[PDB]
Paper text:
HPVs are non-enveloped, double-stranded DNA viruses comprising multiple copies of the major (L1) and minor (L2) capsid proteins. The native T = 7 HPV virion can be mimicked by an empty icosahedral shell, called a virus-like particle (VLP) which consists of 72 L1-only pentamers. High-level neutralizing antibodies elicited by L1 VLPs can block HPV infection; however, protection against HPV infection is type-restricted, and there tends to be little cross-reactivity among HPV types. Each L1 monomer folds into a canonical, eight-stranded β-barrel (BIDG-CHEF), with the strands joined via flexible surface loops (BC, DE, EF, FG, HI).
To ascertain whether structural divergence drives HPV type specificity, we scrutinized the crystal structures of L1 pentamers of genetically close or distant HPV types. First, L1 proteins of HPV33 and HPV52 were cloned and expressed in E.coli, purified, digested by trypsin, and crystalized. The crystal structures of HPV33 and HPV52 pentamers were determined to resolutions of 2.9Å and 2.75Å, respectively, with refinement to Rwork/Rfree values of 21.0/24.0% and 18.7/23.5%, respectively. Both structures show a hollow lumen in the central axis, and two neighboring monomers intertwined by surface loops. It should be noted that the surface loops in the non-crystallographic symmetry (NCS)-related monomers within the asymmetric unit of HPV33, HPV52, and HPV58 might differ slightly in conformation due to their intrinsic flexibilities. Then, five L1 pentamer structures representing two groups (group 1: HPV58, -33 and -52; group 6: HPV18 and -59) were aligned to compare the structural differences among their five surface loops. We also observe that the surface loops of types within group 1 or group 6 have quite similar main-chain traces, with minor differences noted among the loops between the two groups. To test our hypothesis, we genetically swapped the loop sequences on five surface regions (BC/DE/EF/FG/HI) between the two most phylogenetically related HPV types—HPV33 and HPV58—and generated 10 chimeric L1 constructs: H33-58BC, H33-58DE, H33-58EF, H33-58FG, H33-58HI, H58-33BC, H58-33DE, H58-33EF, H58-33FG and H58-33HI. Notably, five of the nine HPV33-specific mAbs (C2C3, C14A2, C16D7, 9A3 and 7A3) failed to bind to the BC loop-swapped mutant of HPV33 (H33-58BC), suggesting that the BC loop of HPV33 may involve a major neutralization epitope. Analysis of the extracted cryoEM map of one 5-coordinated HPV33 pentamer and one 4E5 Fab revealed that the 4E5 Fab is bound to the outer rim of the HPV33 capsomer at an angle of ~58° to the pentamer surface.
Residue numbers in the entry:
A (entry chain B): 19 to 56, 60 to 175, 183 to 404, 437 to 473
B (entry chain E): 19 to 406, 437 to 473
C (entry chain D): 19 to 176, 182 to 403, 438 to 473
D (entry chain C): 19 to 56, 60 to 176, 183 to 403, 438 to 473
Write the structure that this text describes.
Amino acid sequence: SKVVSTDEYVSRTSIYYYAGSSRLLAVGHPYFSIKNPTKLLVPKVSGLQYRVFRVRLPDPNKFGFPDTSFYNPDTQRLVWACVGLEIGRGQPLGVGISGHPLLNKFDDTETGNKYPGQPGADNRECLSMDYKQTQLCLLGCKPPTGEHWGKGVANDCPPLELINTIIEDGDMVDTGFGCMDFKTLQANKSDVPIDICGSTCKYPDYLKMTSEPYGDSLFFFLRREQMFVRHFFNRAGKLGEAVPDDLYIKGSGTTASIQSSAFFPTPSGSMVTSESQLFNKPYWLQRAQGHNNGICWGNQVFVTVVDTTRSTNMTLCTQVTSDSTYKNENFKEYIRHVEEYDLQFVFQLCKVTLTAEVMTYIHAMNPDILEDWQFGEDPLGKYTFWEVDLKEKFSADLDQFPLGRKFLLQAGL
Amino acid sequence: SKVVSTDEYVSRTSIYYYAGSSRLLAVGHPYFSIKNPTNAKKLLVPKVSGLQYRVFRVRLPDPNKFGFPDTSFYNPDTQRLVWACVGLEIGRGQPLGVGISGHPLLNKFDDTETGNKYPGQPGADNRECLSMDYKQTQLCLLGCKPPTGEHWGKGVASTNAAPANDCPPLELINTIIEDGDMVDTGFGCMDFKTLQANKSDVPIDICGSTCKYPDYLKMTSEPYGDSLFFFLRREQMFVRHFFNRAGKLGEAVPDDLYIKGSGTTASIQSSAFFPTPSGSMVTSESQLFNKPYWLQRAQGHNNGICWGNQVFVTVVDTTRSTNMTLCTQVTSDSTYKNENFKEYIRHVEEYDLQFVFQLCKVTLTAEVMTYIHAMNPDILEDWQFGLTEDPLGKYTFWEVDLKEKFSADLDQFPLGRKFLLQAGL
Amino acid sequence: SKVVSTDEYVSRTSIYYYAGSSRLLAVGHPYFSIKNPTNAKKLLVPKVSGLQYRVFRVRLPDPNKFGFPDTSFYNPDTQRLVWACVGLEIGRGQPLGVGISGHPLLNKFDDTETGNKYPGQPGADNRECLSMDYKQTQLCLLGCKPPTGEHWGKGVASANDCPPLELINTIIEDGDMVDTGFGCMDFKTLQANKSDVPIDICGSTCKYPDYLKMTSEPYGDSLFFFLRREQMFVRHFFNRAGKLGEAVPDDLYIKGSGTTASIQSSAFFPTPSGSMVTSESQLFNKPYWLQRAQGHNNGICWGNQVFVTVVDTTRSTNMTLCTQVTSDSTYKNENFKEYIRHVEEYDLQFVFQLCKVTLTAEVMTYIHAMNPDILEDWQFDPLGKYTFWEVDLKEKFSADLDQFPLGRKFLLQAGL
Amino acid sequence: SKVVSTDEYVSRTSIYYYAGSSRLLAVGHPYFSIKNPTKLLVPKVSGLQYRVFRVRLPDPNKFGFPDTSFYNPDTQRLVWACVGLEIGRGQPLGVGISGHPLLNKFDDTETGNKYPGQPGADNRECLSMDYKQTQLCLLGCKPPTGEHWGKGVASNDCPPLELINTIIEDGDMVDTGFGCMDFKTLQANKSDVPIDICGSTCKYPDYLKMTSEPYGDSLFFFLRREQMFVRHFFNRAGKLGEAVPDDLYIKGSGTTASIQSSAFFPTPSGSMVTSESQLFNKPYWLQRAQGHNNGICWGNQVFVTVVDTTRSTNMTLCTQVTSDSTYKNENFKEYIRHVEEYDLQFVFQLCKVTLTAEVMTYIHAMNPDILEDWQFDPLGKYTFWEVDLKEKFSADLDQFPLGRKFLLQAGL
């Protein structure tokens, strides 16, 4: 049908509630997960992962309100609207490093590699790098949609297909090598560092999400990406598509067999700073750009976050044997990464008058809304999200919490 | 039980006072303290580093025992007095500059920025002498309660059944930030002494220390808001170099992430990478200090009330971390000989705390006493003198005594003059 | 007594005057002065460096003896006149640029940025020829009192050989070295080997303005106002040769053996770098209008003199000069002599406002407490031991403001 | 005399005119000009040169106006006033490189040069660098005045330095990071700076002298933006003319017996060029000048001085001498060329001057040639880029980009 703003059929009340997730912690390995010598022994926790929080809200129609005289349950139903959001972030600012002990890096081509080139059977090197810096935040009542390139269906070069998937908690953000399925498009498992070489890097499909009719994916969003090229390398292996003859004059002797033009850069996120921080500050959802003005259908909200500005990897070191002199054989080296979150919300209570035209519109939009309201199995159960249960976390005492105090000043309340 | 703003039970007066700490100096060694090879537990050269927290415990005179010229502004039978902080400037001397830390035996193996070709040759001891500049940090915290920090330490492991791996379990620990504690430097906020056994993975000024980061989340969400009247912070860093560690790799790369090598690439190289930080450049424009802050409305419920007649000023300033090179001549000669000179390193810190305080009165009604007792009973204990030791003594602070430093002549001091223009008086 | 603003006992008139120093030039060697080899304790080539303080002592004509066209605007029986500074522009010539300092025999041992592998090779003399660009600094101070600086010197000797450090306040003189990235310390007395910092500071003292002390002095005669802009970052990471005076404690490392048996020097030191000079960050060649000072002296130039203190390293370019001793058809190093010279170009511009002071009994008591020399020169030089760049403006005052650049700007600013 | 603003004796009319030079192109070699084995074959065209345009205006007293009833030629004379200016710049942004195949560079002293030093007879190297970035714009009816350091009069072999003021001519070299000096006379070895300045003089605008001149004819207004940093640290070969004093260092021995050269010098770098930092391709409206001449173009001429290193890209050209199936270096010749594209746009306002006895006395004191040309070429020794606009004035302002902008600015 013709989509209308929620402001036309969802009534706002003066009832507000605060809800906080409290400290959220993830501790794990930044490059790979550790399996049980049989489930996960040590999870993969990286600053380059998507954090997709599925925040569960209490059903307002079954909520224990002190006074339920503000609406008529015979003809009306209740729904929460998000009006304030602050994403707390702990831990200091810092930059981590990823790498590969056997990266397919051949020669440094920044100042030039003189002829002749010597390509043996295995010239992989141990190289590491810092990734492209990314901060982003998405808010909606529907999980976010990402885009990435995978191997499609049919030189033998793989066909490229742009694939849309739901971004799950733990998915890898793009790091400077693009949003692609590195497992299926890079067979040697050695062209990108190990924390993505068997993974898929996804980029938010902002274009698709903003153009969807009802606007359930993006109540609003913020994003800040930056990177530059730090080093200039080339690949080892057969060059799949040779340079055409009309683009160069053939060499002779030392320059007879041409060198590999399969170049690749290493990225660098440059500096992280406090002023460029997107987080630890409130966002007030006054007017969404989509038609859904922050209405949390189904009593759930999705907060999607990427934050590489706190990607420091901690070095842990144990001593196996105590000796009076230093021996490398006496110590084991470990790496660990942590993430500290604290989600804060301010919700506004809303009522929906269920006329025949309103029920028809809602049924077109989403039939499950009317069934859950008991009027006219989780399809998202196949996906992985960070569940945040706030059913027992709602409070009407706004000024007893930081974001609630800010909301009272913002709305002048 | 329901926390309310101090604006509801603390009455403001038109009485203002200035107080200044005058020059505060700390001179010492930036990497370690030097102990006395003799009694008694005293220090020859203290550890003074630009990477340290400065936690000042500012003692204020008890206004209930203060010699006021006219005490007709309140009723001591039913009321009590307390100071409220309304103005603060953190003076900083010495020029801007950046210091450097390092380790003569740092566990640095290979440079992996442009790649390290195979094979790698790891002998018994490949430690090198390397140094670096740290992440730049400016921050300042103000409250009537000492600040709370967070860092990672060694926890306890579940040993049932058998050991999963010898990697130490990590636990997030909250402690009070004491004067002299090390700020995070780019290697995280952790207990390096207990989590890095080889004493050689980070420079020596933190390798036997704990780096702490302020638990801003915990401090702002605590109900009464006595820790943070306000705060300012400015952090920046980038990755300068890319290295890897020597020693046994505790957790090997799984097989599905690479195709095994052969010959030169048979023994995989260490993927225990680590960066060196860099705070980039310090500039005058980004300075947090040497400017006044006016505390008009705090975000917490404590609107600058200095309970217990004390204030905590927490400062980190790495923008003046210059380490001075000192050089003595042992033997006089006409030609240069390396053994005729001794090389020393010293670091200095120059502070000057300035405040403007507002006198306040509290009426001890039945409702006020019930509330204050819930919040903090020690407030009512210090007030009570008849009817009808140090809880923080176990911690180390830079004591700043202002009991004899309060002055009512505001226009006679720099911050007092600024306050008069700001408030229009 | 209790200090009050000059606004309470100094009356302003509508009489304004312009004064300009015209072009001021200093030409010399940036690293050291060249003294006379025979028959003289005078200098052939002065030390002129972009890292020096310029402290101008500006002499103003006594307004009480000034040849005014009509002197009926005040009563000489009960009043006295004094100049107040209301406008200032510090003109700077020469293009923006960065100079370089160094030391042919600097105590640099190894580069410790990517690591120095063991073992270390400490011979008898490993000093190297090294150069660097300094921390960038712009600052400007204005007062009727010479500026006060701070630096670290050798203290009172009072269980090791490390010198005790003492914070010293001195008057900043014209030609003193500003801090360059190694701190404000007496390098001649605190670094005996003369080889830890470049030669243009290794036998000098670097001073930093004691802003805290100057702003806290009661009358506020030192800083009518000030501007400052400093920046630097660490460019390189080195360590020192020589005996390590204070060894690393044993609990901070596990001892090595064989190649790593003899521990390396942890006496690290950085080289600074001022990054870029830009037009946007220039403090100079723009006017400053002194409407209300933060101190109690609101720009009143007691003693008919003003001190202008400037540091500007954004024009520290050192020119390379090359002479040909023998003309030859091919290039030979033995035919040329290499010289280095540095120049500084200033142009001080002022707008002064004439003021009168009514000498009542209460005012005379206050002024006498503040400064007794003020009332005696009125009828109603301990600074000779210091070195300043004397700027004589006694014959440079003009009331025709619109005939000069700063004067035209002032007329537009105040709407006159 | 006593100088007064032109607003006091020059009356403004509501008559405005547009004038544009159209495309201005210069193509040449960025390091040196090429002369014939007999004129000029290839001029020296570099992004480090001053462009000084001498703009000729039509004499308004002899201009063909449609209606001349707005003034009395018996008692008045006409003059143009500049009220709008835009300096059009074509070609993309980019940075060029200068160098010297035989530069007097000895050792790299950035991380240290270990002893002993090996100073042979000729240790010059082939080195190149990017220069200090400079954007500047000057406007007046008098050519600009520059400053540079030259050899003074001798009164101990260091040359005496003297500060010299000259008129900046089109083609003069701006300072590049080595100062504003006469490199031909102050650097005898011809190898201390790159070849495009080593036999030239780098000049810097004498802003102080021009702003302090009484009538203010050189600078109606100006804009400037300079930036640079030190990229590398070197030292010079040759005899050290002035040795380090003995009290500043402890004598060496053995390998460190013979001290190394402390004749250090930096290489500059202009860092990055950006669209945001552009001074050009935007209009400047001359509403009130800081000098007393408020944009009055005495003598029917205007001088526009421009420096722009943000388009200093040098193009590499390569010809093929012999066709062969494999690559051989001797079969190709390598050339270097640089280009500059300008487009000067002006908006002029017609003004009338009533020549009373007081006004004529003032004008004659200021400049006697003004009244003589009014009937009521001293600069032939200098080189300028001549811009003839005598046949380029148009009263149809809304037909041109700058003219449309002016109509919006003044609300006309």
